[PDB]
Amino acid sequence: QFSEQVNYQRALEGELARTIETLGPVKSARVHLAMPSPSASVTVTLEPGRALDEGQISAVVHLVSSAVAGLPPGNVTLVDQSGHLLTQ
Amino acid sequence: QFSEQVNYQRALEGELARTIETLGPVKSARVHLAMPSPSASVTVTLEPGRALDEGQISAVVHLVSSAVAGLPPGNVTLVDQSGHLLTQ
Amino acid sequence: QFSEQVNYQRALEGELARTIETLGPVKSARVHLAMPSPSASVTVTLEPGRALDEGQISAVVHLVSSAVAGLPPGNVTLVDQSGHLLTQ
Amino acid sequence: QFSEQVNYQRALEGELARTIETLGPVKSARVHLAMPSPSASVTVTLEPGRALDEGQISAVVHLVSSAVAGLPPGNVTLVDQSGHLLTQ
Amino acid sequence: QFSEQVNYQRALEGELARTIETLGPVKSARVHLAMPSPSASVTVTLEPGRALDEGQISAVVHLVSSAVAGLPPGNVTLVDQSGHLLTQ
Amino acid sequence: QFSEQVNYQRALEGELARTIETLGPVKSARVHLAMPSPSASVTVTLEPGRALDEGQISAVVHLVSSAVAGLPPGNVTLVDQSGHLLTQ
Amino acid sequence: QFSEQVNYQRALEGELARTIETLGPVKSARVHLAMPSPSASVTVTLEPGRALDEGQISAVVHLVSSAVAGLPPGNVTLVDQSGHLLTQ
Amino acid sequence: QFSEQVNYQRALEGELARTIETLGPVKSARVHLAMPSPSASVTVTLEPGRALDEGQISAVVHLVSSAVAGLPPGNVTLVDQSGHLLTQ
Amino acid sequence: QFSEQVNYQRALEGELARTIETLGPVKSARVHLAMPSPSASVTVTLEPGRALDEGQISAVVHLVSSAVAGLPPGNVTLVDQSGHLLTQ
Amino acid sequence: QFSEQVNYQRALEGELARTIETLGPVKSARVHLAMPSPSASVTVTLEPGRALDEGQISAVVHLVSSAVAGLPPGNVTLVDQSGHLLTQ
Amino acid sequence: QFSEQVNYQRALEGELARTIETLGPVKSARVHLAMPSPSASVTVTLEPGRALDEGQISAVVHLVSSAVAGLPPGNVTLVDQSGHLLTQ
Amino acid sequence: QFSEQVNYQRALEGELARTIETLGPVKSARVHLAMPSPSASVTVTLEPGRALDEGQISAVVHLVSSAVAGLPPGNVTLVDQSGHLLTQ
Amino acid sequence: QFSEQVNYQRALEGELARTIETLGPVKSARVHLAMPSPSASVTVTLEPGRALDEGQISAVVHLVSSAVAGLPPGNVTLVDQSGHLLTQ
Amino acid sequence: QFSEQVNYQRALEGELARTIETLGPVKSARVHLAMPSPSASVTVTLEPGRALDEGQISAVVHLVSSAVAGLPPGNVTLVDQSGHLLTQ
Amino acid sequence: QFSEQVNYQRALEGELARTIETLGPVKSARVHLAMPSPSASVTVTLEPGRALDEGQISAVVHLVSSAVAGLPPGNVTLVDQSGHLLTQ
Amino acid sequence: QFSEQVNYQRALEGELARTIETLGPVKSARVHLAMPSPSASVTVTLEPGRALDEGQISAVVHLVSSAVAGLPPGNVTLVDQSGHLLTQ
Amino acid sequence: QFSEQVNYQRALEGELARTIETLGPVKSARVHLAMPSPSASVTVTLEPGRALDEGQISAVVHLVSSAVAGLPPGNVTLVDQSGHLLTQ
Amino acid sequence: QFSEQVNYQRALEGELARTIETLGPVKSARVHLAMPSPSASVTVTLEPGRALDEGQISAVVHLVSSAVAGLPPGNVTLVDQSGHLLTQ
Amino acid sequence: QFSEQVNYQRALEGELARTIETLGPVKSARVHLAMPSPSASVTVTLEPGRALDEGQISAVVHLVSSAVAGLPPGNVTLVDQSGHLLTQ
Amino acid sequence: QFSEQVNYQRALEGELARTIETLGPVKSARVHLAMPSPSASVTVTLEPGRALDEGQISAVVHLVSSAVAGLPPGNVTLVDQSGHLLTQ
Amino acid sequence: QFSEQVNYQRALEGELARTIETLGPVKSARVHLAMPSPSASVTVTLEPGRALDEGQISAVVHLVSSAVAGLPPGNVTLVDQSGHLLTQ
Amino acid sequence: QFSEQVNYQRALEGELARTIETLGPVKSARVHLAMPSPSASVTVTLEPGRALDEGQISAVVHLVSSAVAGLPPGNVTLVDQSGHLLTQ
Incomplete structure (x- = not known):
């Protein structure tokens, strides 16, 4: 029953990261969720010579x-392939 | 029983994204639902040289x-293939 | 038991969309239901060179x-193959 | 038990639509029921060059x-093959 | 048990419509019952060149x-093969 | 148990209609019962060139x-092969 | 248990009608019982050229x-082969 | 258990009618009982050219x-082969 | 258990009638009992040219x-082969 | 259990009647008992040309x-082969 | 259990009557018991040309x-082969 | 259990009568017991030409x-082979 | 269990009578016990030409x-082979 | 269980009588016990020409x-082979 | 269980009597116990020409x-082979 | 369980008597115990020409x-092979 | 069940450390979690000639x-391959 | 369970007596225990020409x-091979 | 269940010590945990010619x-390969 | 379970006595324990020409x-191979 | 279950002593734990010509x-290979 | 379960004595524990020509x-191979 809600979360993370890849400047994303007040941590790897704007x-x-x-946008953490925490 | 209401949600997402594809300017959509106050996040990929109007x-x-x-229109998130969060 | 009331809804959607197809200006419809205050979202694809009137x-x-x-007409959402939300 | 009262409703709809076909101006009908305050939605397809009068x-x-x-006549919805909601 | 009181109603309808056929002006009838305040809806198809009188x-x-x-005569609905609701 | 009191009623109707046939002016009868305040509806088909008197x-x-x-004579309905409701 | 008190009543009716046949003016009788205040309905077919007197x-x-x-004589109904309800 | 007290009554009737046959003027009797205030109905068929006296x-x-x-003599009904209810 | 007290009564009747036969003027008797206030009904058939005296x-x-x-002598009924109820 | 106290009474009657036979003037007796206030009914058949005295x-x-x-002498009934109730 | 206290009484009667036989003037006795206030009835058959004295x-x-x-001497009944109740 | 206390009494009687035989004037005795206030009845058969004295x-x-x-001497009954009740 | 305390008493009687035999003047004894206030009855058969003295x-x-x-000496009964009750 | 305390008493009696035999003047003893206030009865048979003294x-x-x-010496009974009750 | 405390007492008696034999003047002893206030009865058989002193x-x-x-010395009974109760 | 505490006591007696044998003047002892206030009875057999002193x-x-x-020295009984109770 | 929430944590640690590796200056990370107020301890090994900035x-x-x-950023511990605790 | 604490005591006695043997003046000991206030009784057999001193x-x-x-020294009993109780 | 939370702790210790090895000056670590207020004791073995600084x-x-x-930094104990407790 | 705490005590005694042997002046010890206030009794056998001092x-x-x-030193008893209780 | 927390402690002791060996001056350690207020006792064996300093x-x-x-440092006991308790 | 905490104590004693052997002056130790206020008793055997100092x-x-x-140092007992209790 526990490996039910974990084999699922591992699929969400792999599905969410498949869309962020199909997003232009991003070459490959890598997201982990923290569903218990949840959180996430995207780790986009932008294409060579690119940078995500403020919007x-x-x-x-x-x-x-x-x-x-139940995940507010104040808990999502975005990080490049060069450190650079983009969120706040 | 849990993989019952999850194997279904994965089909809704795949059905909802099959219609948004058959919508003109959109070339391929990718929607995830967040049914627990639900939410969704469409990730349309507009056709080459196109942009969705305000309506x-x-x-x-x-x-x-x-x-x-139970999903109000204030929870749906639309995003192009070039970032550009279209909703508010 | 859940896949009972879901295998049925998937048939209603496929039956409802078979009639809207046999309706003249419509070439192919695509309806999803949201039976929990229910809702629906038709996605008609009008014939080449046609447009549904106000009535x-x-x-x-x-x-x-x-x-x-239990579905009032204030919850049905009609959309063409060119965006253009027709309902209100 | 549920597919009992559904395999039956699907037969009523197919029987009700077989009579409306044998009605003169109608070439082929298509009725769906909404038995939970029930409702119905006939979708007659009149013969070439015909129109149902007010009576x-x-x-x-x-x-x-x-x-x-338990279906009052205020819940039945009649629609042609050219849109044209005939009821009120 | 439900298909008991339904396989029976389908026989009543087929028996009731076999007598209305053997009635002179009628060429073929088609009756549906609505036994839950019940109702019925005969759909007689009069012989070529005939019309049922007021009595x-x-x-x-x-x-x-x-x-x-338990079916009063105020719930029976008679209809020809040319529309023409004959009851009130 | 239900098809017990129904296989029986179908025999009563077939027995009652076998006597009304052996009655002179009647060529063939057809009776249905409505045993729940019961009722009946005979549908005699008089011999060629005959008509039942007032008695x-x-x-x-x-x-x-x-x-x-438990069937009073005020609930029996007699009808010819030419419409003509004979009872009141 | 029900087909016990019905297979019996069908024999009483067939026995009662075998005696009324062996009664002189009667050529063939046909009686149905209505045992729930019971009733009966004999349908004698008098011999050619005969009529039952008042006694x-x-x-x-x-x-x-x-x-x-428990069947009073006020519930028995006698009818000839020519209509003619003989009782009152 | 019911066909116990019925297979017996059918034997009483056949035994009672075998004695009334061995009674002189009677050629063949036929008695039915009505055991629930019981009753009986003999249907003697007197010998050719005979009639039962008042005693x-x-x-x-x-x-x-x-x-x-428990059958008083006020409930027994005697009838000839020519109608003629002999009791009162 | 019922056919116990009935197979016995049928033997009593056959034994009682075997003695009344061995009684002189009687040629053959035939007795039925009515054991529930019981009763009996002998049906003696006197020898040719004989009649039972008052004693x-x-x-x-x-x-x-x-x-x-428990059968008083006021309930026994004696009858000849020529009617003639001998008791009172 | 009932055929226990009946197979016995039938033996008593046959034993009691075997002694009354070995009694002189009696040629053959025939006794029935009525054990429920019991009673008996002897039916002696005296030898040719004999008659039982008062004692x-x-x-x-x-x-x-x-x-x-429990059988008083006031319940025993003695009868010859020529009627003639000897007791009182 | 009943045929236990009856197969025994039938032996007592046969034993008691074997002694009364070995008693001189008696040639053969025959006793029946009435054990429920019991009673007995001896039926001695004295030797040719003999008579029991008063003692x-x-x-x-x-x-x-x-x-x-429990059988007092006031209940024993002695009877010869020529009637003649000897007791009182 | 009953044939236990009866097969025993039948042995006592046969043993008691074997001693009274070995007693001189007695040639053969025959005793029955009446054990429920018990009683006995000896039936001695004295030797040819002998008589028991008063002691x-x-x-x-x-x-x-x-x-x-529990058998007092006031209940024992002694009787010869010539009647003659010897006790009182 | 009863034939336990009876097969034993029959042995006591046979043992007690074996000693009284080995006693001089006695040639053969025969004792019965009456154990329920018990009693006994010896039946000594003295040697030819002998008589037991007072002691x-x-x-x-x-x-x-x-x-x-529990047998007092006031209940023992001694009797010779010539009657002669020796006890009191 | 009863034949346990009886097979034992029969051994005591046979053991007690084996010692009284080995006692000089006694040639053979024979003792019975009466264990329920118990008692005993020795039956010594003194040697030819001997007599037990007072001590x-x-x-x-x-x-x-x-x-x-539990057997006092006031209950033991000693008797020779010539009567002569020695105890008191 | 009873033959347990009896097979043991029979061994005690045989052991106690084996020691009294090995005692000088005694040639053979024979002791019985009376264990329920117990008692014993030794039956020593002194050697030829010997007598036990007062001590x-x-x-x-x-x-x-x-x-x-639990056997006091006031219950032990010593007896020679010549009577002579030695104890008091 | 009883033969447990008896097979043991028989061993104690045989062990206790094996030591008293290995004691000098004693040639062979023989002890019995009386364990229920217990007691013992040694039966030493001194060597030829010896006598146990006061100590x-x-x-x-x-x-x-x-x-x-639990055996005090006031319950032990010592006896030689020549009577002579040594204890007090 | 415990090795369920441990085989999972060991996968999180191996997944979290696979992203920190794909981060630029980091050559290989190594994270342990302390989920019971949880904690973590990353152990990044920066690329040759590199150092993580303050942001x-x-x-x-x-x-x-x-x-x-549920892991605040005040519990995460970052350490290089040269000691140098980077967090506070 | 009893032969458990007895097979053990028999070993203690055999072990305790094996040490007293290995004690110098003693040639062979023999101890019995009386464990229920316990006691013991050693039976040492001193070497030829020896005597245990006061200490x-x-x-x-x-x-x-x-x-x-739980065995005080006031319960131990020491005895030589020549009587001579050494303890007090 | 206990070897569950012990086979795990033994893996943590082996994993924690694999990172401290990949830390520069450390050549091989060896950590034990004391999870019941837990504690740890690292035993680093620095590389030849090295010493950990204060930070x-x-x-x-x-x-x-x-x-x-739940392990505060005040419970961790660090020790070199030359004694030298580094923590406080 | 008892032979558990006895097979163990027998090993303690054999182990305790193996050390006292390896003690110098002692050549062979022999200890018994009295664990219920326990006690012990060592039986050392000093080497030829030796004696244990006061300490x-x-x-x-x-x-x-x-x-x-739980064994105080006031319960241990030490004894040589020449008597001589060394403890107090 | 006990050999679970003992097979583990024996491994801790063997692991703790494997680190103290890898500590420089120590050549081989040997630690025992006393986990019930626990304690330990290390028994280091320093290398030839070495001594642990005060720190x-x-x-x-x-x-x-x-x-x-739960082991404070006040319970650990350190001892060399030359006695010399190093702790306090 | 008892041989669980005893097979363990026997191993502790054998392990504790293996370290005291590896201690310099000691050649072979031998320790017994008394775990119920526990105690121990070491029995060191110092090397030839050595003596443990006061520390x-x-x-x-x-x-x-x-x-x-739970063993205080006031319960440990140390003894050489020459007596000489070293502790207090």
Whole structure:
């Protein structure tokens, strides 16, 4: 029963990261969820020579904040392939 | 029993995204639901050289807000293939 | 028991969309129901060079509002193949 | 037990629509019931070059309002093959 | 047990419609019952060049109102093969 | 148990109609019972060139009113092969 | 248990009608019982050129009123082969 | 258990009628009992050219009134082969 | 258990009637009992040219009144082969 | 258990009647008992040309009154082969 | 259990009558008991040309009154082969 | 259990009578017991030409009164082979 | 269990009588016990030409009174082979 | 269980009598016990030409009074082979 | 269980008597116990020409009084082979 | 369980008597115990020409009084092979 | 059940450390969680000739603080391959 | 369970006596215990020409008083091979 | 269940010590945990010619304090390969 | 269970005595324990020509007092191979 | 279950002693734990020609005090291979 | 279960004595524990020509006092191979 709600979360993370990949500047994403006040931590790896704008961050924040039950956008953490915590 | 209401949600998402594809400017959509106050996150990928108008957003918002039980249009999140969070 | 009331809803949607197809200007419809205050979202694809009039919308609204138990016509959402949310 | 009262409703709809076909101006009908305050939605397809008169609508309304338990004639919805919601 | 009181009603309807056929002006009848305040809806198809008189309607109304338990004659609905709701 | 009191009623109707046939002016009868305040509806088909007199109606009314438990003669309905409701 | 008290009543009716046949003017009788305040309905078919007198009716009434438990002579109904309800 | 007290009554009737046959003027009797205030109905068929006297009726009445438990002589009904109810 | 006290009564009747036969003027008797206030009904058939005297009746009455439990001599009914109820 | 106290009474009657036979004037007796206030009914058949005296009756009365439990001599009934109730 | 206390009484009677036989004037006795206030009834058959004296009666009375539990000598009944009740 | 205390009493009687035989004047005795206030009844058969004296009676009385539990000498009955009740 | 305390008493009697035999004047004894206030009855058969003295009686009385539980010497009964009750 | 305390008493009696034999003047003893206030009855058979003295009686009394539980010397009964009750 | 405490007592008696034999003047002893206030009865058989002194009695008394539980020396009974009760 | 505490006591007695044998003047001892206030009875058989002194008695008394649970030295009984109770 | 929530934590640690590896300056990470107020301890091994800036630490802190349920960023511990605790 | 604490005591006695043997002047000991206030009784057999001193007695007393649970030295009894109770 | 939370702790210790090895100056670590207020004891073995600085101790303290649930840094004990407790 | 705490005590005694042997002056010890206020009794056998000093006794006392649970040194008893109780 | 928490403690002791060996001056350690207020006792065997300093003792004390749950450093006991208790 | 906590104590004793052997002056130790206020008794056997100093005793005392749960150093007993209790 526990490996039921875990084999599922591992699929959500793999599905959520398949869309953020199909998003333009992102080359490959990697998201982990923390569903117990949940949280997430995207780890996008932007394409060579690119950088997400100030409104392109909320694109990837709300793309995950909304696809996960009860996850406000204040808990999503976005990080590049060069450190650089993009959220606040 | 849990994989009952999850194997179903995975089909809704795949059915909802099959209609948004058959919608003109959209080339391929990708929707995730967050049914626990539910939410959704469409990730349309518009056709080459196209952009959804201001009233073409509510088309795709209500197309999902209504096909999901108890989902107001204030929870649907629409995002292009170039970031650009279209909803508010 | 759950896949009982879901294998049925998937048939209603496929039956409701078979009639809206046999309706003249419509070439192919695609309806999803949201039976928990229910809702529906038709996605008609009008024939080449056609547009539903102001009274031809209530035709397709009541065609679905009445074929579904407890669904007022204020919850049915009609959308073309070019965005254009036709309902309100 | 549920597929008992559903395999039956699917037969009523197919029987009710077999009589409306044998009615003159109608070439082929298509009725769905909404038995939970029930409702119905006939979708007659009139013969080439024909139109139901003002008293020929109540013929098809009462033909269905009476063949279904507890269905007033104010819930039956009649629609042609050209939109044109005939009821009110 | 439910298909007991339904396989029976389907036989009553087929028996009631076999007598209305053997009634002179009628060529073929088609009756549905609505036993839950019950109702019925005969759909006689008169012989070529014929029309039921004002007292020939109560013949077919009471022929069904009486053959069904608890069905007043104010609930029976008679309709020709040309629309024309004959009852009131 | 239900098909017990129904396989029986179908035999009563077939027995009651076998006597009304052996009654002179009648060529073939057809009676349905409505045993729940019961009722009946005979559908005699008089011989070619014949008509039941005013006292020949009560013959066929009481012939059925008495052969059925608790059925007053005010509930029996007699109808010819030419409409013509004979009872009141 | 029900087909016990019905297979018996069908034998009483066939026995009661075998005696009324062996009664002179009667050529063949046909009696149905209505045992729930019971009733009966004899349908004698007098011999060619004969008619039961005023005291020959009570012969056939009491012949049945007494052979059936709790059946007063005011409930027995006698009818010829020419209509003609003989009782009152 | 019911066919116990019925297979017996059918034997009493056949035994009671075998004695009334061995009684002189009677050629063949036929008695039915109505044991629930019981009753009986003898149907003697007198020999050719004979008639039971006024005291020869009580012979056949008490012959049956006494051979049946709780049956007063005021409930026995005697009838010839020519109608003619002999009792009162 | 019922056919126990009935197979016995049928033997008493056959034994009681075997003694009344061995009684002189009687050629063959035939007695039925009515054991529930019991009763009996002897049906002696006197020898050719004989008649039971006034004190020869009480012989056959007490011969049966005493051989049956609780049967007073006021309930025994004696009848010849020529009607003629001998008791009172 | 009932055929226990009946197979026994049938033996008592056959034993009691075997002694009354071995009694002189009697050629063959035939006694029935009525054990529920019991009673008996002897049916002696005296030898050719003989008659029991006034004190020879109490011989056969007490011979049976005493051989049966609880049977006073006022209940024993003695009868010849020529009627003639000998007791009182 | 009943045929236990009856197969025994039948042996007592046969034993008691074997002693009264071995008693001189008696040639063969025959005793029946009435054990429920019991009673007995001896039926001695004296030797040819003999008669029991007044004190030879109490011999046979007490011979039985004492061999049976609770049987006073006032209940024993002695009878010859010529009637003649010897006791009182 | 009953044939236990009866197969025993039949042995006591046969043992008690074997001693009274070995007593001189007695040639063969025959005793029955009446054990429920018990009693006995000896039936000695004295040797040819002998008679028990007045004190030879108490020999045979106490010989039985004492060999049986609770049997006073006032209940023992002694009788010869010539009647002659010897006790009182 | 009863044949336990009876097969034993029959052995006591046979043992007690084997000692009284080995006592001189006695040739053969025969004792019965009456154990329920018990009693005994010896039946000594003295040797040819012998007689027990007045103190030789108490020898045989106490020889039995003491060998039996609860048997006073006032209940033992001694009798010769010539009657002659020796005790009191 | 009863034949347990009886097979034992029969051994005590046979053991007690084996010692009294080995006692000088006694040639063979024979003792019975009466264990329920118990008692005993020795039956010594003195050697030819011998007699137990006044103090040789208490030898055989106490030899048995003490070898049996609860048996006072006032209950032991000693008797020779010539009657002669030696105890008191 | 009873033959447990009896097979043991029979061994004690045989063991106690084996020691009294090995005691000098005694040639063979024979002791019985009376264990329920117990008692014993030794039956020593002194050697030819010997007699136990006044203090040689208490030797054999205490030899048994002490080897048996709860047996005072006032209950032991010593007897020679010539009567002569040695104890008091 | 009883033969448990008896097979043991028989071993104690045989062990206690094996030590008293290995004691000098004693040639063979023989002890019985009376364990229920217990007691013992030694029966030493001194060597030819020997006698236990006044303090050699307490040697054999305490040798047994102490080897047995709860046995005071006032209950041990010592006896030679020549009577002579040594204890007091 | 315990190895369920441990086999999972070991996978989280291996997944969390696979992303921190794909982060630029980090060559290989190694994270342990302390889920009972949880904690974590990353052990990044920076690429040859590199050092995480002051805002590149919060990148790796929030990358783990958010991917673990209920883990504040004040509990995450970051350490290089040269000691140097980077967090506070 | 009893032969458990007895097979053990028999081993203690055999072990305690094996040490007292290995004690110098003693050649062979023999101890019995009386464990229920316990006691013991050593029976040492001193070597030829030896005698235990006054302090050599307490050696063997405490050697046993201490090796047995709850045994004071006032209960141990020491005896030589020549009587001579050494303890007090 | 206990070897569940012990086979796990043995893995934590082996995992925690695998990271401290990959830390630069450390050549091989060895950590034991004391999870019941838990504790740990690292036993680092620094590389040849090296010594952990004052801030390089907190690196290894927090590396373990945080990877273990509920372990403050005041309980971690760090020790070199040359004694030298580094913590406080 | 008892032979559990006895097979163990027998091993303690054999182990405790194996150390006292390896103690110098002692050649072979032999200890018994009295564990119920326990006690012990060592039986050392000193080497030829040796004697334990006053402080060499407490060596062997405390060597046993401490190796046994709850055994004070005031209960240990030490004895040589020449009597000589060494403890107090 | 007990050998569970003992097979584990034996492994802790063997693991704790494997680290103290890898500590420089120590050549081989040997630790025992006393987990019930626990305790430990290390028994280090320093390398040839070495001695632990005053701060090198707390290294080995805290190395064990911390690796064992609930063991203060005041309970650890350190001892060399030359006695010399190093702790206090 | 008992041989569980005994097979363990026997291993502790064998392990504790293996360390005291590896201690320098000691050649072979031998310790017994008394775990119920526990105690121990070491029996060291010093090397040829050696003696434990005053502070070398507490080495071996605390080496055992600490390796055993709840054993104060005031209960440990140390003894050489020459008596000489070293503790107090």
